[PDB]
Ligand binder design. Structure first.
Ligand SMILES: CC(C)n1nc(C(F)F)cc1C(=O)Nc1ccc([C@H]2[C@@H](O)CCCc3cncn32)c(-c2ccccc2)c1
Ligand SMILES: [Zn+2]
Lengths: 76, 134, 55, 275, 277
């Protein structure tokens, strides 16, 4: 519903979504928060990188899951 | 250094094609053994003359220098040849680096001798150093 | 001699050869030496002592 | 070696940093539990980099939180290809029954576990002796296994040696003193070793200890080797080095004098000639 | 008791992170305090790759103008493995977060490459406290001293030498990307107490110290230092007609190192050569 994404340094951002929202929507929300392009940014939950095609059905938290943001260069 | 007194037996089990001559009166067997002797002698010598190199490896002077220069230019052997005085210089130590390694060997002898004292008399050794500093 | 040094396209360039190969032999021969004898070089290069100095 | 245990200096620093971080975090010193890994070659220990393995220390009992260690196993396997679990470390004095219980828990994971007990509260000169590991004594009835201390070695690589030297006192107390204290300590320990060897020689001469024909022969060889490099080429090289350092000092005393003269003329130009 | 570097104060860290004092002034960070464990693990990983290149993250905090580093963990490598291993920072129980990344230059000096400066620009842009460490394994092994590489970069579109040993190849990359980053003064901190007590294992060596073979181990380092000092002094002279103070300091340190080596050699000669004459 309303999740928090933390960077490596520890900066926390609180972004609000809906259960049917996509991971591209997550990246766009982070873009509107700071300005990170979606292709230069990686999202991790439970130590596993999210795939870019699944609509957060197994990421059901209902209580603001903590996401991990990792900056990466374009295309590696 | 392998002499001729321990090579006659080895020629017995050699295959017949391995006893061929290299158009110089020397078989294949006693061609890689003079190269081996030359490389091994580079570790026991800092510099050797042509005459004494041939008095130890046979083949006195015609090909003793030729083999020495042939091993070099190929990376097989380190050294340089001064043809005017007929001396092959193998490898020399720069004094100061030798001083450090000789000091290290001296300190290692102290440590090794220390273990021997403790092994023989563990009771006498233990009480020794504690009162020594105080 | 009648198969190599016949046409002018190879005879003219035979002078450039027999000198490059001699140069390569000379370079390798003097590699492990700090002081070498010029007459000693001449016997290996199969040329005159004066020609060794010019080379 | 008789027992083939080789500890690395990085492990000791790891345990010290762990203990200090926990002590600062929780205010008071607290017992910590770890996990030593390394390379085993049949009869070799060779401990290396250790990781946290926090587990639990609840009340008086240690719970089996080794699932976290299981997750850490594949993590450390990604950066350490040739490294495997060997044992665990702790902070305290003599072994305790709680240590026995934790060791029993650890033997479930591995067949040959060690037990390091780095003591941070020690106030005696020689270093706390690392690991008290055991082959486990079995008697009729209860196992009641104890720990049979065996010796350890401090084998270290070149990078570890350079790092340890950098952390140690090397270059308010001036650089001359810091550079000279290291030499003073090294010469002091060498002098102690030589003095104890001389004491053994004197004891053998008087008759306190039995006459060992080989120790005195080695001592005679050591005495004969004492004048190291006394050649004329060594003296020439040493004097060349001394002259080079003297010139390098002259070039730089000149620089300092030039700097001070520049400061003096800067102060002089604003005091007498006001232009 | 000093210490006080530990005991991570969460409230102060959040306050200093929310204040963001380095946004106003670009030259805020000037001092980098690497820990003993940080150096040990960094150098071990750097040498555990030989001529190959290694890279990992380094954890720490920020206090005023200084950046303190308490720990550092290696990485498996660009693929998913590195990103999966990054979760270690928040998986373990540790309050130090992450402060930067370290990466080795095996034989290519200590400078920052173009890709390196671009990654540092990105990291600083979206993760405000970040520093890059560019230590060199081959140089510390050969010369016996550790060379540091704290090389925080400048922001994009902003305008405002030491280890110049790269002979031919990569010196071109050095020249183009030279004003895009500024070095940080590295000042090591020892926690004292436990680690100061346990540093007696260095005294256990006692043989590499007694036979150090200095003044030839790092002869190339001293020649490079003198080569840098030459145009440092030329720049001081050109400005004069305070760079002169910096040149004098560099000359003093180089001369002090040379005299320390000579003192060690003299002590060794008195200890060993002047016995049984
Ligand atoms: C901190 C890490 C995760 N990171 N974050 C971001 C940023 F985009 F977020 C970006 C990065 C990141 O891995 N960068 C990077 C870039 C370049 C190299 C190599 C590259 O040029 C190839 C030539 C050698 C070289 C000399 N100097 C940097 N390199 C490396 C790298 C260094 C050592 C081992 C493996 C890789 C890492
Ligand atoms: Zn780089």
């Amino acid at each position: 519903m309303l999740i928090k994404v933390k960077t490596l340094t520890g900066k926390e951002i609180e972004i609000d979504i809906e259960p049917t929202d996509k991971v591209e929507r997550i990246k766009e929300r982070v873009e509107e928060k700071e300005g990170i392009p979606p292709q230069q940014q990686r999202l991790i939950y439970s130590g596993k990188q999210m795939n870019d095609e699944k609509t957060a059905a197994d990421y059901k938290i209902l209580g603001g899951s903590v996401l991990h943001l990792v900056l990466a260069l374009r295309g590696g | 250094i392998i002499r001729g007194n321990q090579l006659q037996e080895f020629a017995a089990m050699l295959m017949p094609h391995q006893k061929a001559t290299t158009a110089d009166g020397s078989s294949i067997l006693d061609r890689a053994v003079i190269e081996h002797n030359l490389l091994s002698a580079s570790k026991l010598y800092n510099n050797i003359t042509f005459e004494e190199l041939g008095a130890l490896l046979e083949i006195p002077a015609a090909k003793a220098e030729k083999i020495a220069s042939q091993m070099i230019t190929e990376g097989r052997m380190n050294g340089f040849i001064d043809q005017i005085d007929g001396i092959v210089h193998f490898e020399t130590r720069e004094a100061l680096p030798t001083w450090d390694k000789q000091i290290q060997s001296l300190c290692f002898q102290v440590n090794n001798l220390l273990e021997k004292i403790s092994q023989t008399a563990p009771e006498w050794t233990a009480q020794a150093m504690e009162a020594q500093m105080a | 001699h009648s198969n190599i040094m016949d046409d002018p396209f190879i005879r003219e360039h035979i002078e450039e050869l027999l000198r490059n190969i001699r140069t390569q032999v000379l370079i390798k021969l003097i590699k492990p030496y700090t002081r070498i004898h010029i007459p000693f070089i001449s016997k290996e290069l199969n040329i005159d002592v004066a020609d060794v100095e010019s080379l | 070696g008789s027992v083939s245990v080789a500890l690395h200096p990085l492990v000791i620093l790891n345990i010290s940093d762990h203990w200090i971080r926990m002590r600062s975090q929780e205010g008071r010193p607290v017992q910590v539990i770890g996990a030593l890994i390394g390379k085993q070659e049949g009869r070799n220990i060779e401990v290396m980099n250790s990781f946290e393995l926090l587990s639990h220390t609840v009340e008086e009992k240690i719970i089996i939180d080794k699932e976290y260690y299981y997750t850490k196993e594949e993590q450390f396997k990604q950066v350490f290809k040739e490294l495997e679990f060997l044992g665990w470390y702790t902070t305290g004095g003599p072994p305790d029954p709680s240590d026995i219980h934790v060791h029993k828990q650890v033997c479930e994971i591995i067949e040959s576990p060690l037990f390091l007990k780095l003591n941070p509260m020690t106030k005696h000169t020689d270093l706390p002796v690392s690991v008290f590991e055991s082959v486990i004594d079995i008697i009729n009835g209860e196992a009641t296994m104890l720990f049979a201390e065996l010796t350890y070695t401090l084998a270290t690589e070149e990078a570890e040696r350079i790092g340890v030297d950098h952390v140690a006192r090397m270059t308010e107390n001036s650089t001359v003193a810091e550079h000279l204290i290291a030499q003073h300590s090294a010469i002091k320990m060498l002098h102690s070793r030589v003095k104890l060897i001389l004491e053994y020689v004197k004891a053998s001469e008087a008759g306190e200890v039995p006459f060992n024909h080989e120790i005195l022969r080695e001592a005679y060889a050591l005495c004969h080797c004492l004048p190291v490099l006394s050649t004329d080429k060594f003296k020439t090289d040493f004097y060349d080095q001394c002259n080079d350092v003297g010139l390098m000092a002259y070039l730089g005393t000149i620089t300092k004098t030039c700097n001070t003269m520049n400061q003096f003329v800067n102060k002089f130009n604003v005091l007498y000639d006001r232009q | 008791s000093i210490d006080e570097i530990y005991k991570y104060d969460k409230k102060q860290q959040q306050e200093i992170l929310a204040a963001k004092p380095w946004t106003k002034d670009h030259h805020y960070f000037k001092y980098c305090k690497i820990s003993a464990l940080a150096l040990l693990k960094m150098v071990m990983h750097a040498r555990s790759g030989g001529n190959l290149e290694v890279m990992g993250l380094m954890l720490g905090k920020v206090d005023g103008e200084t950046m303190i580093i308490m720990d550092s963990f290696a990485l498996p490598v660009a693929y998913e493995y590195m990103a999966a291993y990054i979760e270690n920072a928040k998986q373990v129980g540790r309050l130090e977060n992450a402060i930067g990344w370290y990466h080795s230059h095996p034989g290519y000096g200590c400078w920052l490459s173009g890709i390196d400066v671009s990654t540092q620009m990105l990291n600083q842009q979206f993760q405000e406290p970040f520093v890059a460490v560019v230590i060199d394994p081959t140089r510390t092994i050969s010369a016996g001293k550790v060379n540091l590489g704290a090389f925080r970069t400048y922001p994009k579109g902003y305008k405002p030498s030491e280890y110049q040993t790269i002979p031919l190849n990569k010196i071109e990359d050095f020249g183009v990307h030279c004003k895009q980053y500024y070095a940080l003064e590295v000042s090591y901190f020892k926690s004292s107490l436990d680690r100061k007590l346990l540093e007696l294992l260095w005294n256990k060596y006692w043989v590499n110290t007694l036979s150090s073979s200095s003044l030839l181990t790092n002869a190339d380092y001293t020649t490079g230092q003198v080569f840098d000092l030459s145009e440092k002094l030329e720049q001081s002279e050109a400005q004069l007609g305070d760079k002169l103070a910096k040149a004098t300091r560099d000359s003093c340190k180089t001369t002090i190192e040379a005299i320390h080596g000579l003192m060690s050699q003299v002590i060794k000669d008195k200890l060993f050569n002047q016995i049984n004459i």
